[PDB]
């Protein structure tokens, strides 16, 4: 039925090395500061625009 999976750690290392283009080089949530879902909801409720954010 092909529902659950578990791998070994060199397999995960190789699949993480091959996928280096579709992934980001971020390490922590110090990025997305005032640029996440809750800040966008706050800018939605206050009817203001973040520079780079939606309108």
């Amino acid at each position: 039925t092909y529902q659950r999976w578990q791998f070994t750690l060199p397999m995960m290392s190789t699949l993480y090395r091959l996928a280096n283009q579709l992934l980001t080089d971020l390490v922590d949530d110090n990025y997305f500061y005032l640029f996440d879902l809750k800040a966008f909801f706050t800018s939605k409720a206050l009817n203001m625009a973040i520079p780079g954010g939606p309108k």
């Binding site: 110090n30 990025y31 500061y33 005032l34």
Partner: protein, 75 residues
Amino acid sequence: TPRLMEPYYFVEVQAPADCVSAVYTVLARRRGHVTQDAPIPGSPLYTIKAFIPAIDSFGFETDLRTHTQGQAFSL
């Protein structure tokens, strides 16, 4: 000859070695001055110790965390 006096905050900023010049850029427009720039032993992050006027300190943390792409942090 009476004069007025304002409070000055002491500010310590934890930041990577690249955004230090951006910290010098941001503190330049809020009438402050950097007193100490010191590397942390055993860590690549630096510490910037400065004095700032308290009336200029509104939105200061937000200015650093916006201008240094969220890498610097201040108290």
